[PDB]
Design an enzyme around this catalytic site. Structure first.
Site, PDB file in Angstrom:
ATOM      1  CD  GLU A  11      -3.115  -0.764  -0.074  1.00 56.60           C
ATOM      2  OE1 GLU A  11      -3.017   0.233  -0.399  1.00 56.60           O
ATOM      3  OE2 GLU A  11      -3.699  -1.607   0.371  1.00 56.60           O
ATOM      4  CG  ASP A  20      -7.754   4.212  -3.728  1.00 60.59           C
ATOM      5  OD1 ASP A  20      -8.398   4.527  -4.956  1.00 60.59           O
ATOM      6  OD2 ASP A  20      -8.891   3.549  -3.319  1.00 60.59           O
TER       7      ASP A  20
END
Ligand SMILES: [Cl-]
Ligand SMILES: [Cl-]
Ligand SMILES: [Kr]
Length: 162
Positions: A11, A20
């Site tokens: 991540e 994202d």
């Protein structure tokens, strides 16, 4: 290697609100703030999650805190889901981390929907599961990460991560 380091690699870490892979406002180590297109809304959810006026920026410690809470929540989500828990309890330690990663990314709901993969994993048919897992939007949208998690389930080792 462990779940935390594994997700920290998949991540990354960003201290300012970012979007994202799907365009949603997120912060820290993959902590989704909102699906809303509004940055204010995002800023709002952030301040509420941290407990202070952050202005869109957080410290490393605050990011680590959110992450801990998110990992905890993910495990708890698994154990509370009737389709997931049985799989999870049948697995070895390494593979359990693979399942937690998927849940952290896509939510309990999302993962609970890989019915066929779930059954193969439960039966310990590794190669078969790996192939079925790749037949998914998840794999086609984030193929590098997906390949890492898939290899994890296939091998039961952390090689994809070294
Ligand atoms: Cl929160
Ligand atoms: Cl990826
Ligand atoms: Kr799965």
């Amino acid at each position: 290697m462990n779940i935390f380091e594994m997700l920290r690699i998949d991540e990354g870490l960003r201290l300012k609100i970012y979007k994202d892979t799907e365009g949603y406002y997120t912060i820290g180590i993959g902590h989704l703030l909102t699906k809303s297109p509004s940055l204010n809304a995002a800023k709002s959810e952030l301040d509420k999650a941290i407990g202070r006026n952050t202005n869109g920026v957080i410290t490393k410690d605050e990011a680590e805190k959110l992450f801990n809470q998110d990992v905890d929540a993910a495990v708890r989500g698994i154990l509370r889901n009737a389709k997931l828990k049985p799989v999870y309890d049948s697995l070895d330690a390494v593979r359990r981390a693979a399942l937690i990663n998927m849940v952290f990314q896509m939510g309990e709901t999302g993962v609970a929907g890989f019915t066929n993969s779930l059954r193969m994993l439960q039966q310990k048919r590794w190669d078969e599961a790996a192939v079925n897992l790749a037949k998914s939007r998840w794999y086609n949208q984030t193929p590098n990460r997906a390949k890492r998690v898939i290899t994890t389930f296939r091998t039961g080792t952390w090689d994809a991560y070294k």
